[model samples]
Target: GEVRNIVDKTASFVARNGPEFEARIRQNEINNPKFNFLNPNDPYHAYYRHKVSEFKEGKAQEPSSGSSGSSGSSGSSGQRPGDPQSAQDKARMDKEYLSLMAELGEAPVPA
Candidate 1:
């Protein structure tokens, strides 16, 4: 009779029939993977929560080599396809870093 039952029922219902209710069920699942919450004293609760957080953040840069090369139209934002502008900020920061090291190196080290 734990709260896990609530999550189980809610997630199961949504997973099984949300599509018929005028919602983007598949996309929603992809965006937010479901997991049962656990009590603070639950042994693996912290581990499960950490994993869920990682998944929701979409930290998987690639969907594995087995996923193939088709269906590239997802609304996910971080999928950078070799855009040159993405490197602009890195270049600017590189120049600033070089200047910083140069300034630091001018100070005499007790060699």
Candidate 2:
């Protein structure tokens, strides 16, 4: 069952959004073009996360390319302690959390 699943799923998440995994994803000021999540208005979306099943689990697309981190949850250089953007982004994402949990009544209203 392990080979039947899991491995392919992880690899799929890697190809799309490949650049987001680079060392820059965690950085502040996404004007650098490395962080796709920062431009909420932009049309482009991450390439990873597309199910391998969608591609039928063959060679798949070339990973968008980036510096892969050791884990999806953590990696990258240290940030300056108490960075303001960290706090600002924190509050903003707090709202996103609500929307993600929209069934619980926190969904944001589209303008």
Candidate 3:
């Protein structure tokens, strides 16, 4: 899931910045031959082509690309990744508060 998402995001990012990225790549190739555009056996070239095609399609070349398309909303607002109220001690505290308030007849009711 993360793999496809990362690939898709990266592909989209590269597609948006294609010209600058390509220019850097061309400069790198000119400096030192890394990827051969015409040769299919070149690993870098093969992967580059693969990603380029994916960029064209605006999706990752993954088998189950659409399966995990659900975006992650796993933001943790607290230190605990679980429910902060799950401590359960509040259940007794709630009763204690009510019992104490009951003793004091003039006590205001909790909203």
Q: How many Å off is the CA of 96 in candidate 2?
A: 1.0
Residue 98's lDDT in candidate 1:
43
Cα RMSD for candidates in order: 20.8, 15.9, 26.6
- For 1-111, candidate 2 gives per-residue lDDT tens digits of 232232233334333324332223325435644334334454333222344334445655775677667647544775575535455545545444343235333235454
Residues 1-111, model 3: lDDT tens digits: 123333334344445455444444345444434324423555455556577676767644656445464677567674555566455554644554354334433245547
**What C-alpha lDDT do the candidate models reach, one value each?**
0.40, 0.39, 0.47
Model 3: lDDT to the true structure: 0.47
Clashing residue pairs in candidate 3 are: none
Per-residue lDDT of candidate 1, residues 69-106 (tens digit): 67586676857656564555555544443443344342
Q: Considering every candidate listed, which one attains the maximal TM-score?
A: 3
How many clashes show up per model? 0, 5, 0
* Candidate 2 lDDT score relative to the true structure: 0.39
Error of 3 at 69 (Å): 31
